Design a protein around this nucleic acid. Sequence first.
RNA 1: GUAAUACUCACUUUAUUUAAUGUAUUAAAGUAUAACUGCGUUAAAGUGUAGCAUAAGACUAUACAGUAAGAGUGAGACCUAUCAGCUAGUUGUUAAGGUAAUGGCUUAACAAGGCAAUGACGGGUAACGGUAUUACUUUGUAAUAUUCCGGAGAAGGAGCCUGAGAGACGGCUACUAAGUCUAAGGAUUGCAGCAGGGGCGAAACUUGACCUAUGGAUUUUAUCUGAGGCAGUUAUGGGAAGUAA
Lengths: 158, 201, 87
Amino acid sequence: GINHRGEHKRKKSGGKSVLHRKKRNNRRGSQMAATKVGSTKVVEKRARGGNKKYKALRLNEGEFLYKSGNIINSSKIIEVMYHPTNNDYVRTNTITKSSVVKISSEGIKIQDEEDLKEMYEKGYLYAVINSRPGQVGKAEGEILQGSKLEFYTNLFKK
Amino acid sequence: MKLNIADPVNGTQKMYEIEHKAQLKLYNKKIGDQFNGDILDEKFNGYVFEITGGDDAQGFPMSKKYLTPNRIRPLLSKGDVGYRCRRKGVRMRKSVRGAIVSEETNVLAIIVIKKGDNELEGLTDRSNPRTHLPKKDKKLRSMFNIPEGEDIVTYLKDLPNIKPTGHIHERKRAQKEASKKAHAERKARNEAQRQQWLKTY
Amino acid sequence: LSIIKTDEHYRVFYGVDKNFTFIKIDKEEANFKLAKVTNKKVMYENVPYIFTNDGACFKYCDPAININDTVKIDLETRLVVDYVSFK
RNA sequence: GUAAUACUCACUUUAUUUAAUGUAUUAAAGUAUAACUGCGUUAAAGUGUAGCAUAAGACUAUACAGUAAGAGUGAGACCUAUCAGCUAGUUGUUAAGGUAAUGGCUUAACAAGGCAAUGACGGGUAACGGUAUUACUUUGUAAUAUUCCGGAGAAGGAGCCUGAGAGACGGCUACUAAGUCUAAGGAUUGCAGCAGGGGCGAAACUUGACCUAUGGAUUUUAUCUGAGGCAGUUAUGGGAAGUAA
Ligand SMILES: [Mg+2]
Ligand SMILES: [Mg+2]
Ligand SMILES: [Mg+2]
Ligand SMILES: [Mg+2]
Ligand SMILES: [Mg+2]
Ligand SMILES: [Mg+2]
Ligand SMILES: [Mg+2]
Ligand SMILES: [Mg+2]
Ligand SMILES: [Mg+2]
Ligand SMILES: [Mg+2]
């Protein structure tokens, strides 16, 4: 269906290329699975020689880590704020790797810092994903603190 | 059409023939729907009947899940109605018939739910005896209340022989405990070496 | 290799002209076996290990045995008995 | 079919997967369908409804060796100027998806790069690459379907299931070119496998016996084996010899 071969592309000089064999099963691809937000759902895959893969169609209640106090706690996922490569994913609410989100601060026990205090009055905090959702099958990430919060907030919608 | 009927409580099945003027009553009825036997004949008064299968004039069977009057050709797989497999994972096309009953139905398979007034001389009268017994000892002991666990002997004392399967499941259950005996003593031998290995160093 | 009948034992190594030979040996040599270490590291739960050429694993050996030294396998208790260093 | 991505040689894979093998570590009552019995169907090819039908089975995880395979870098290889400019996912940066895995392999955003008289880009081949092996030679040329290693295809194209490993064709689905059976409703075929027939040509053999020896199928002493042996037809060639003393 979808191949990853290299025999079809042009040469370094720009001349055309010619094929001599059919499509092999060794280089075999799949379509994109866009992980949405909703009620949870996980389907299984079969890879080469056993080795089962997990893909997540609709994800909820991802895990996150507090960097200062060094504890890990679960939270809900509300909205997406920024996506690096394509800016259309923010209106469709798809979660991929390295895309910042907005999480509930209910179970989280935060320390007293100047920056997080004003958002902690409301329910929301910020986090950034660090795991492949479509292949591992679950999201994990870090909570934004310090100058890392200064970098992303210049890129927000405003 | 000629109807096929069977008795689930008696184990007898028989065939019968319909007049033509009762055949138009049975049109547009999905497989799996009950109907009263009064509209078919006067002989079948008080009878409750249910449709469960049928064949075509060319021999093609009728499916359950397709909901059409005419012929269809789907890609069947293992276990469906119409295709009996001979290899593994090998699926192919066939030709089946839809669920609803029209003028091209040739025979019908009909179950008996509730007996009417009159008894059938060949269907409802005689009973056919059962033929096979379970091999599992736990349900074999429930029908014949014997506590001393002489399954073949007390059946010979009751005397058609039945061969139980309690010997087979006992064999691998003995072999499963056989591994745990030899595996556990292995953990003692390396620990006696380990404490001895740390005495010098 | 040996036959249980007739008490015949042989050691297998090459001759002189790159061919396989079989040399009859004694019962005092019939016990043991020689091999050569290729790799050594510490496995799970802090247990040392030494890996030979054929793929046997051995633990809790003498710390004076290095990566390239040879061992002497008893072949009946499957325990490392003697070693010869590399120099 | 492919003028090089295929092949040969020298390197890398900390960027990857491996059923059957070897040595080790770990863990441990309930629930279907067959064969069977019994009622049937159609020209054929195949298929259906019952007997709460009834059996054996199914609901541990990893290391390191060992075989097998995938993916990269560089160098070599026919004729043509009456073929001198060529290339736009083309060259690069950032980010993501996907694969067992590196990578414009695919997609967003930005930029203008990349190759050439040391022959780019085109055209032709009556072109499968090396090699064991033959000739002719004073630094080496020419042939190499033929023994062995490697690659590609099963009328032409595309797509996929099972599986450790197939884009498989003595496995399945569709279209195109050729068909065959019928009670006219439908059903069905791939001899570049061994014999054999037809066509084409100047041009090439028995519709034969068998597991004796070498091997393969998860222990191969009795199962299978047109793989592989043993015989018949032919001035394809090379030897040891005859037709007298
Ligand atoms: Mg049944
Ligand atoms: Mg683009
Ligand atoms: Mg050649
Ligand atoms: Mg042909
Ligand atoms: Mg093949
Ligand atoms: Mg092939
Ligand atoms: Mg094919
Ligand atoms: Mg064939
Ligand atoms: Mg032939
Ligand atoms: Mg000839």
